[PDB]
């Protein structure tokens, strides 16, 4: 109407500026030394390729839906928009997979081959925007629009176009994001269960050497034995090495527990200090792997990727819903004029919120990421 041109214009300026900055910094200072940087670079490049043709739609909506740029530019702009959707989707799925691999299983050739394959697949999935998209002079008037053409045989094509967006743009990719981020959460849970339980075991180990009576030592060993049993369950995602590490450990708490029961504080504290030797020989190699996995969540790249993935799917939720309502209407499942008018009057609004993430992805670097050196240098 009147805000779509303005929203499109602000998206264009902010996104092109931010994505140029992101490409510059990633390629110059980050130097593509990480797989996540290659996928983020490709995401920024896809956003730039989308924003290049964005001014055409801003003026096209501004001049009351009139297209003076020709059939070739109509095809190219539609293909660029669909390509942006599909390429961003695939790059986010690969970013989530890479984050899962980095978190749970601590490769540039495969990364670049995957980027090329993603670009080719996104270009192929935008083929309907190239084939069935031509300028259309409305009746005998001079008004020209960039319309989506069909045929008699392709009567189910509008179903195919709408369902392809839901499935290949939201449904299947969101499963992989959920699958990867659930396995990340499972690994972070067992990395924190082992770390939190050992802190309880380590906090009370300072109490034993500090206390000077049998009652305080026995009460401290009681909470050390329960933490040692809990930690033995938090097996990191070779099995006997972890289990036998705590079978020895709980066996030394018992020896210290049956020395504090006799009121022998000197031997209860001496046997408690023997848990240092068991920790280093068997358990210390797993507290580092638990700490290394636990502090990767603190990495700013993890925040950036999670913020980009979270906002992209949330911004596309309203559009995929109304796309799914539209295909039901085409199927005739929903037959009501009241519902149809709501879908038609909300499609342009949701199509603008869906592509608003092109100008917010660069801003997630400044907010989530703390490494905005070149953002202040430049």
């Amino acid at each position, epitope marked *: 109407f009147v805000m779509i041109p303005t929203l499109y214009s602000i998206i264009f300026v902010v996104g092109i500026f931010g994505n140029s900055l992101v490409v510059i910094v990633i390629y110059f200072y980050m130097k593509l030394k990480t797989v996540a940087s290659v996928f983020l670079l490709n995401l920024a490049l896809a956003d730039l390729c989308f924003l290049l043709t964005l001014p055409l739609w801003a003026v096209y909506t501004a001049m009351e839906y009139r297209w003076p740029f020709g059939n070739y530019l109509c095809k190219i702009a539609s293909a660029s928009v669909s390509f942006n959707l599909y390429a961003s989707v695939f790059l986010l799925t690969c970013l989530s997979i890479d984050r899962y691999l980095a978190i749970v299983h601590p490769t540039m050739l495969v990364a670049k081959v995957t980027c090329i394959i993603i670009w080719l697949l996104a270009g192929l999935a935008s083929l309907p925007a190239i084939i069935h998209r031509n300028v259309f002079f409305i009746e005998n008037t001079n008004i020209t629009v960039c319309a989506f053409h069909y045929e008699s045989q392709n009567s189910t094509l509008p179903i195919g176009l709408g369902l392809t967006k839901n499935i290949l743009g939201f449904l299947f990719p969101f499963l992989i994001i959920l699958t990867s981020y659930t396995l990340i959460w499972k690994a972070l849970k067992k990395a924190y269960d082992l770390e939190d339980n050992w802190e*309880t075991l380590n906090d009370n180990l300072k109490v034993i050497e500090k206390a000077d009576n049998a009652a305080q030592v026995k009460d401290a060993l*009681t909470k050390m034995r*329960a*933490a040692a049993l*809990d930690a033995q*369950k938090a097996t990191p995602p070779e099995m006997k090495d972890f289990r036998h590490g705590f079978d020895i450990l709980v*066996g030394q708490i*018992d020896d210290a527990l*049956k020395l504090a029961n006799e009121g022998k504080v000197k031997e209860a504290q001496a046997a408690a200090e023997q848990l240092k030797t068991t920790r280093n020989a068997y358990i210390q190699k797993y507290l580092e792997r638990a700490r290394s996995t636990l502090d990767k969540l603190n990495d700013d790249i993890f925040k950036i990727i999670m913020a980009i993935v979270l906002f992209f799917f949330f911004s596309w939720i309203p559009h995929q819903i109304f796309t799914f309502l539209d295909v039901l209407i085409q199927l005739g499942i929903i037959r009501d004029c009241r519902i149809a008018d709501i879908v038609d009057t909300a499609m342009p609004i949701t199509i603008c919120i869906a592509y608003f993430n092109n100008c917010l992805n660069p801003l997630f670097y400044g907010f989530l990421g703390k490494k905005f050196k070149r953002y202040f240098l430049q």
Partner: antibody
Amino acid sequence: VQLVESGGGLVQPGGSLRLSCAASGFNVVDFSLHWVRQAPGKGLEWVAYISSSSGSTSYADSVKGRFTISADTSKNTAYLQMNSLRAEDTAVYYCARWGYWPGEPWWKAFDYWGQGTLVTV
Amino acid sequence: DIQMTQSPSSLSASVGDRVTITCRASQSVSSAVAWYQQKPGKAPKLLIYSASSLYSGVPSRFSGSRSGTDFTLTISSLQPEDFATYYCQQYLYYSLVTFGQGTKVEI
């Protein structure tokens, strides 16, 4: 695998009574034999235990200083010696079995309880 | 001196019904909680050990669960021989054995 109590009966308050925990099947050295008493109409209360492998006798605060638990490897029995019995010690005494820590036998708690004996003061 | 608490002191249910017994520990005992069935005049019998495992020779209808400090015993389908007294025991250490108050299941 069964634990059978013995020596229970009616004794005067303040006297001395010895209970037995003769067992068949397993060996006393491989398991720690505990004692749990249940007052008539009340729940179970842990009393004392022995670890015949090394000797780790322990008692509850209500019985510590009066009760004494010992085991005989040759006879495969555990003896609980009671002293200064009062009106609070009249309960059904159960002798329970509990494995040692390394492995699953520890995680299996009292699983083969004794048949149960009645002690009345 | 970890104290075990069983809120449902008395439960009444019919055959085939679902009965849930909860248990809470004073300290953060690990998954070391055993459930026992004691018919009147008989020694208790172990049903659930490690707060989740099922003892050998025990019907599968008995189910044990742990939620941090909260331990729950559940029976999928009640039976005429399932009416007894159930106790909650924490066995974190030999000298640290404390049983629950005891819950009686009625018809």
